[PDB]
Amino acid sequence: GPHMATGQDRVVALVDMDCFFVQVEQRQNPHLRNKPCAVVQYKSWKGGGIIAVSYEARAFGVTRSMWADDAKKLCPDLLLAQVRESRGKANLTKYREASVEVMEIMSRFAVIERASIDEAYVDLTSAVQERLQKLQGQPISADLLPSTYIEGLPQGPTVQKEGMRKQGLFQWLDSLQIDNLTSPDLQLTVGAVIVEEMRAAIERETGFQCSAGISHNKVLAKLACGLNKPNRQTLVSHGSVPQLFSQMPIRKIRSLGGKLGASVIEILGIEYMGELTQFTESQLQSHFGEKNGSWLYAMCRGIEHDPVKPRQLPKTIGCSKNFPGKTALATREQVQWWLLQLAQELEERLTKDRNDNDRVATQLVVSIRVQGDKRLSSLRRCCALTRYDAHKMSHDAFTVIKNCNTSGIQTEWSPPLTMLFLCATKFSAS
DNA sequence: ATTATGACGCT
DNA sequence: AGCGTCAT
Ligand SMILES: Nc1ncnc2c1ncn2[C@H]1C[C@H](O)[C@@H](COP(=O)(O)OP(=O)(O)OP(=O)(O)O)O1
Ligand SMILES: [Ca+2]
Ligand code: NA
């Protein structure tokens, strides 16, 4: 009844760049603009592995994880840009620096949580309150929402995409109660107005287009963002949840894409998010644990409380390289040489981080995979990180893993290593 | 022979 | 601590 909280207290957005690494390459090389194109890493094995795909190229069926040689079979005119190689490994600096450009623009509008290299959550609750004051009961014009979709509309008693968008928006704005500063739907709408402004600023100042979701929490905002890509934003209201979730596969919701989501489906014998509403909170806790059960009970009702954390910078800085099949490292000299390459890249990034962000890492984590293990990581060990010096870091990393060498022979390494990873963690102000 | 990352949960 | 899950 009146005491039943509905998770409508906040306005949260998720802003995500469209085909991010591709846009970075298209900005730099105008010949790639408005073309089917993809970004690839390495080149020798099957033309390289695709890591980002333009929307033009997606229309041909090109996807992430595809080998470029195979992508070319679907899309013979596909254009490719290659990730830079330094010290024998892929170097993602150009994209990290592009990411910073976007995050700094978003930060002007509100506190953000960096969720990945190309996306951030935004807590707009206070910004919306402020804007509501300026508006002073004045209605919201569709002109302020030129790229916004209202999920679930139009509905009730044109055959073009943009036509439908506008009909939905009109129905939504027709129904709004602008006299109530505390209407959650009004708050979302003003939230969307602000996100239009944020997205315009990002595009003006960087050249990059993005999409966004606006809702009452991070999970719905993320889901919303994906509903209308590219270059559009989507408002998912609390009221839109029952119909949206009624046919929404469980795996689509963030954190349910893996084993947990599979177990929800298997154990409960359901397929869609909305079907979760028929279980009690205790029932869900019984199958999935106290924390997951409570989360599921609220989430299937559109309710989620995870805060937008005030964190714009990554918490760890890492460097990693695989050594698949016949390239696995089988000698001590090999292992030491590659640890050095990784350590040198890591030192470079750490030094820049210290200068830019007034902090120092204090722990070095070393991880390897051995040939045969289905797991991505086989062994992880930490040691102290007291100096930003690659030779020291590489020597220390070797020291902590050297006992893994099954080989009786000193110079040989067995089993061969198929992955090396160095990660700096535990930052302190400096 | 996806690869290169990065955040958070469990015990 | 070291491992596992999920994500981009
Ligand atoms: N599995 C991966 N391996 C390596 N790099 C990845 C992987 N997934 C994503 N990336 C990199 C390249 C992407 O351009 C960037 C952002 O990822 P993501 O947001 O999932 O897709 P995207 O921005 O390329 O397309 P979209 O428009 O669908 O969001 O991060
Ligand atoms: Ca993206
Ligand atoms: Na993303």
Side-chain angles (χ1 to χ4, degrees), chain A residues 279-289 293-294 297:
Chain A
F279 302 90
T280 68
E281 187 176 2
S282 304
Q283 281 183 304
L284 295 177
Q285 284 172 325
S286 79
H287 296 294
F288 312 112
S294 280
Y297 181 88

Side-chain angles (χ1 to χ4, degrees), chain A residues 108-154:
Chain A
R108 303 204 309 256
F109 293 80
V111 163
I112 72 170
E113 178 184 342
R114 184 196 193 269
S116 73
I117 194 159
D118 84 325
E119 78 195 79
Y121 294 92
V122 191
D123 191 323
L124 291 171
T125 306
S126 295
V128 160
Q129 295 299 112
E130 293 189 20
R131 188 68 174 268
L132 274 163
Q133 299 301 348
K134 294 194 309 187
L135 270 37
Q136 294 295 50
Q138 172 189 0
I140 301 177
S141 157
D143 294 341
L144 299 183
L145 296 166
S147 65
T148 293
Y149 279 83
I150 308 299
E151 177 58 28
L153 302 178

Side-chain angles (χ1 to χ4, degrees), chain A residues 77-103:
Chain A
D77 292 317
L78 183 69
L79 300 181
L80 302 173
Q82 284 171 257
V83 177
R84 169 173 174 199
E85 280 170 70
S86 300
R87 301 183 238 268
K89 67 178 295 299
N91 190 299
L92 304 176
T93 301
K94 187 197 304 185
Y95 316 103
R96 287 189 188 105
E97 297 185 349
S99 176
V100 172
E101 289 181 68
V102 171
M103 301 292 166

